[PDB]
Amino acid sequence: IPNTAHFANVTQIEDAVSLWAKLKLQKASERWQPDTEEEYEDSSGNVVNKKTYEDLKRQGLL
Amino acid sequence: SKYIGTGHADTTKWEWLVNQHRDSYCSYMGHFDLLNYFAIAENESKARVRFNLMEKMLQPCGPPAD
Amino acid sequence: TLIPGGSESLVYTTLSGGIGILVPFTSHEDHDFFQHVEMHLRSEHPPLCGRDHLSFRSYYFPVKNVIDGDLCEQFNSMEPNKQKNVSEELDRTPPEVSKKLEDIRTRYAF
Amino acid sequence: LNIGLQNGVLLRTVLDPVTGDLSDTRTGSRPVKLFRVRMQGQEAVLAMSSRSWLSYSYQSRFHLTPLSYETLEFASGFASEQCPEGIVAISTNTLRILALEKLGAVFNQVAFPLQYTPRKFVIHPESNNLIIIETDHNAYTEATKAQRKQQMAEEMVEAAGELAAEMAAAFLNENLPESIFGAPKAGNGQWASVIRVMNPIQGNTLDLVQLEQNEAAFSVAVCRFSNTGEDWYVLVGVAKDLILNPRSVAGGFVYTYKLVNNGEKLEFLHKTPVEEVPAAIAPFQGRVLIGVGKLLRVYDLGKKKLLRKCENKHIANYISGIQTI
Amino acid sequence: IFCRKQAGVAIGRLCEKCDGKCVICDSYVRPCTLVRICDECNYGSYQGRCVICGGPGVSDAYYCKECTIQEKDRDGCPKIV
Amino acid sequence: MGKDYIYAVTPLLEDALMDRDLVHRQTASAVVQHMSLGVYGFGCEDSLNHLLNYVWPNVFETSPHVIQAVMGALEGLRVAIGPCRMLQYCLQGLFHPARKVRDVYWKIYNSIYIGSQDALIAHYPRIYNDDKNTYIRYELDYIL
Amino acid sequence: NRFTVAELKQLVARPDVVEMHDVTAQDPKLLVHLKATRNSVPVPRHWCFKRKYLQGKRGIEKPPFELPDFIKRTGIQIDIDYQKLHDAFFKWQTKPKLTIHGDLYYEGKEFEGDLSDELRISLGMPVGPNAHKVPPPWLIAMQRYGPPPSYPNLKIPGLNSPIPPLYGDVFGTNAAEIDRTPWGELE
RNA sequence: UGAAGCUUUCAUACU
Ligand SMILES: CO[C@@]1(C)C[C@@](C)(O)[C@H](O)[C@@H](/C=C\C(C)=C\C[C@H]2O[C@@H](C)[C@H](NC(=O)/C=C\[C@@H](C)OC(C)=O)C[C@@H]2C)O1
Ligand SMILES: [Zn+2]
Ligand SMILES: [Zn+2]
Ligand SMILES: [Zn+2]
Incomplete structure (x- = not known):
């Protein structure tokens, strides 16, 4: 776990690992992840199926 | 201390917040174009908005602790 | 730009049905003259209901780089004695002050 | 005294053995004709150019105001049993008598009635038509009003009493005008919204789309998408089951229309759901930016809905406006 | 040390000793607004007396420009008790 | 007349505000107060905010003359700089765990509140509702 | 009946503003929330110091x-x-x-391709000629080994820039691969 | 590397 201002005045191990899990969840949530967060509509039907992720589109266009 | 709305080292969150809610409602009653904004937003007559604010003046933020 | 062959202004609109503009100054001399007009009219022609003019335009934040031209055009409606007392401090006559007030208005708006 | 040039420009000089005042107004390319008239029962001069102006001070309020008509060539005051105070003005192949009866105003206005409180309108760049959204709280839609009235009728006809005299058929015929008697303000989370296409020269309504009962429009935009051709689209952001105090909303939608027939008709394309009120929509580089509550998103046009492309999640409270240079 | 009861029409006065210096911030530069005092401080034998040292008043008491800017003229009767 | 000379005396006031001597900081605070009330409506907020950044650390001073001069300078900056900045300086200390910080900050806040109570309406920060009480001011969230 | 630091760090949205004494307040949740407002400079930091303010080192x-x-x-x-x-x-x-509004002053805060003409005169490098090749002695290694990967947009005379460029003490230029006029300004 | 506080019989300076 990196040393940051968040982990100050924290002296116990399990408290540190739990607060690290919390901070990880928070930050990972608040970023923009294009791989799972994106709306592609492949040209397979070209007028349907807008639920394609960024990976299924490559599999369909391969 | 004699002025209503002042605080001190023992002031709680509830007293602070009800003080600012109460003078917010009074400021809304005073300024003519804020009441216009609210009456257009919620689609009511201005007399009705004034009466609603006066009725809300009594117990803003709910009843106190314990 | 409101008039053909005029200058660009910032037009705003209000919830009470009012329309107004904010126009930039192009020289330091006009700015200084209008600043002195506002200063002298703040004292010798105070608001009617007991308000301080500088305190009213600083209601939530202090004024910064705006001249109130609605206070300045109240010069044309004062009495001739006070118009002379005001004009003789700007080193000018009342007709010249009136012409200078009309010039900036007709430059931008009607 | 007033000095009229042969151009559309004027001079002025106060009467005295020497000129004391000076004021010139660039207000034409045609010779100025100065004529005598009487406004407010006192003297005034009707200057005339390609446009005809009225010059009048007013208790030290100098006004050079134009009029809402085109060029004339001669005029003077008029008086008759018909109207004892007017003007006799002459035009090309014309003999007119005119009048001016507005006590010192700066704008003249024409009005066109609407249905609900207007929130925002955009201008179509090709046809110069207006796309307006109107929305009201504590309001019924047209269909809800009709069915509520039919409900009240069928319930008052079964009041269990001689079933022999019908006030219900008289209650259903004539609707009292709402511009005079008010709209029925009924409900706390009830909304009513409308999209309107209007010509600004005339006042005629070109198209009208009514939305469902508790949908409230807050944003509108007209744009073109790069992946499509030169087609225009209209995007409308709508809230779903909004409560104001305490604030609560069930969701939101973005409508898409195709704006066909030279900017005169809207045709529904699809309807994309969002998890918060879309309060701002702005065209951006062949795509569109949408503020969905706290979130700022990029959206491209799709065949069945709008496709999310990018997103920022660090704006503080609530997006109320978006502007792009 | 200030009376500070809501005032009225009586005009505060200053003695010859300090004539022209503010009653709030005791300052030697630019006077602005005329001082008003409560009715009790001007009642009876107290009329016209200095608002600082109760002695004979020879001039009108003023708030300085800085005090009126800070609205220190709206705090009540400034007669020192 | 001082509006043209505030930039020239700013480094000297910095040095004096950094000076250990009590008179040096007390007199520098007096200078700040007179300069603030002298220029008002003339657009000198940059240097005055810069100088407030050096005046503010002296609020925890026990000497009566120094704290008197500091209060005077703060009330002059309330006029020249505006109440919004002062509320921004007081917010984090209004509810500090230590009673000394709370006493000092509530004194400063009461001084800011008695003058310009009306402007503060537009400056208060948003405070979220809890389970028992409603704290959001909803009327200001309306959007025409 | 009082939080611990790690326990209160788990409840708040911003744990890095929590401090040692913050768990000893009468209302720590409001204190930490106000410490996270998007403004509001903090306390002068010497409230807990027994050496009072300033002084310290002469x-x-x-x-x-x-x-x-x-x-x-x-x-x-x-x-x-x-x-x-x-x-x-x-x-x-x-x-x-x-200085910015956020910035504050503390007792220890008062202490904590182009070449100059003086360095070029002291290093023994002549001035730039009209039409010739006068490279610096660090340019021969760049001509032999290649361009530096840390600054690929840098241009040097002789390798990427032409010889007639070089003017005065400018022996290099960085070439990176609207309506900017302000609106209301005096003339 | 650092933390110089509290008190008086000191003694010395400034208000
Ligand atoms: C001993 O009596 C006291 C202390 C008390 C009192 C109120 O009873 C008495 O009336 C009062 C009168 C005399 C004195 C000394 C007080 C006020 C005056 O003092 C003077 C010593 C200053 N001198 C200056 O002002 C400097 C410049 C000059 C020319 O002014 C100006 C405006 O540039 C300030 C003030 C003008 O002083
Ligand atoms: Zn009294
Ligand atoms: Zn006296
Ligand atoms: Zn004073």
């Missing part, structure tokens, strides 16, 4: 407060010019390094 010796450049150019140290003093004060006026 070791450092400070020279007399240096006069501003233009004032020191006025030649004050006999004929005196007033117009020079006036024109110089107004026309020669400059703005000193101001």
Whole structure:
């Protein structure tokens, strides 16, 4: 776990690992992840199926 | 201390917040174009908005602790 | 730009049905003259209901780089004695002050 | 005294053995004709150019105001049993008598009635038509009003009493005008919204789309998408089951229309759901930016809905406006 | 040390000793607004007396420009008790 | 007349505000107060905010003359700089765990509140509702 | 019946503003929330210090407060010019390094392709000719080994830039691969 | 590397 201002005045191990899990969840949530967060509509039907992720589109266009 | 709305080292969150809610409602009653904004937003007559604010003046933020 | 062959202004609109503009100054001399007009009219022609003019335009934040031209055009409606007392401090006559007030208005708006 | 040039420009000089005042107004390319008239029962001069102006001070309020008509060539005051105070003005192949009866105003206005409180309108760049959204709280839609009235009728006809005299058929015929008697303000989370296409020269309504009962429009935009051709689209952001105090909303939608027939008709394309009120929509580089509550998103046009492309999640409270240079 | 009861029409006065210096911030530069005092401080034998040292008043008491800017003229009767 | 000379005396006031001597900081605070009330409506907020950044650390001073001069300078900056900045300086200390910080900050806040109570309406920060009480001011969230 | 630091760090949205004494407040949840407002500079940090404020070190010796450049150019140290003093004060006026509203001052805070002409004169490098090749001695290694990967947009005369470029002490230029006029300004 | 606080019989300076 990196040393940051968040982990100050924290002296116990399990408290540190739990607060690290919390901070990880928070930050990972608040970023923009294009791989799972994106709306592609492949040209397979070209007028349907807008639920394609960024990976299924490559599999369909391969 | 004699002025209503002042605080001190023992002031709680509830007293602070009800003080600012109460003078917010009074400021809304005073300024003519804020009441216009609210009456257009919620689609009511201005007399009705004034009466609603006066009725809300009594117990803003709910009843106190314990 | 409101008039053909005029200058660009910032037009705003209000919830009470009012329309107004904010126009930039192009020289330091006009700015200084209008600043002195506002200063002298703040004292010798105070608001009617007991308000301080500088305190009213600083209601939530202090004024910064705006001249109130609605206070300045109240010069044309004062009495001739006070118009002379005001004009003789700007080193000018009342007709010249009136012409200078009309010039900036007709430059931008009607 | 007033000095009229042969151009559309004027001079002025106060009467005295020497000129004391000076004021010139660039207000034409045609010779100025100065004529005598009487406004407010006192003297005034009707200057005339390609446009005809009225010059009048007013208790030290100098006004050079134009009029809402085109060029004339001669005029003077008029008086008759018909109207004892007017003007006799002459035009090309014309003999007119005119009048001016507005006590010192700066704008003249024409009005066109609407249905609900207007929130925002955009201008179509090709046809110069207006796309307006109107929305009201504590309001019924047209269909809800009709069915509520039919409900009240069928319930008052079964009041269990001689079933022999019908006030219900008289209650259903004539609707009292709402511009005079008010709209029925009924409900706390009830909304009513409308999209309107209007010509600004005339006042005629070109198209009208009514939305469902508790949908409230807050944003509108007209744009073109790069992946499509030169087609225009209209995007409308709508809230779903909004409560104001305490604030609560069930969701939101973005409508898409195709704006066909030279900017005169809207045709529904699809309807994309969002998890918060879309309060701002702005065209951006062949795509569109949408503020969905706290979130700022990029959206491209799709065949069945709008496709999310990018997103920022660090704006503080609530997006109320978006502007792009 | 200030009376500070809501005032009225009586005009505060200053003695010859300090004539022209503010009653709030005791300052030697630019006077602005005329001082008003409560009715009790001007009642009876107290009329016209200095608002600082109760002695004979020879001039009108003023708030300085800085005090009126800070609205220190709206705090009540400034007669020192 | 001082509006043209505030930039020239700013480094000297910095040095004096950094000076250990009590008179040096007390007199520098007096200078700040007179300069603030002298220029008002003339657009000198940059240097005055810069100088407030050096005046503010002296609020925890026990000497009566120094704290008197500091209060005077703060009330002059309330006029020249505006109440919004002062509320921004007081917010984090209004509810500090230590009673000394709370006493000092509530004194400063009461001084800011008695003058310009009306402007503060537009400056208060948003405070979220809890389970028992409603704290959001909803009327200001309306959007025409 | 009082939180611990790690327990309160788990409840708040911003744990890095929580401190040692924050769990000892009468309402720590409001305290931490106000400590996270998107403004509101913190407390002067010496409230808990027993050495009061300032003072502390008298070791450092400070020279007399240096006069501003233009004032020191006025030649004050006999004929005196007033117009020079006036024109110089107004026309020669400059703005000193101001600080942001957030920034605060502490006792220890007062201490904590192009080459100059003096360094080129001391290094023994001649001036740039009209149409010739006069590279610096660090340019031969760049011509032999190749361009530096840390700055690929840098241009040097002889390798990427032409010889007629080079002007004065400029021996390099960085070439990175609207309506910017302000709206209302005096003329 | 650092933390110089509290008190008086000191003694010395400034208000
Ligand atoms: C001993 O009596 C006291 C202390 C009390 C009193 C109120 O009873 C008495 O009336 C009062 C009168 C005399 C004195 C000394 C007080 C006020 C005056 O003092 C003077 C010593 C200053 N001198 C200056 O002002 C400096 C400049 C000049 C020319 O002014 C101006 C405006 O540039 C300030 C003030 C003008 O002083
Ligand atoms: Zn009294
Ligand atoms: Zn006296
Ligand atoms: Zn005073």
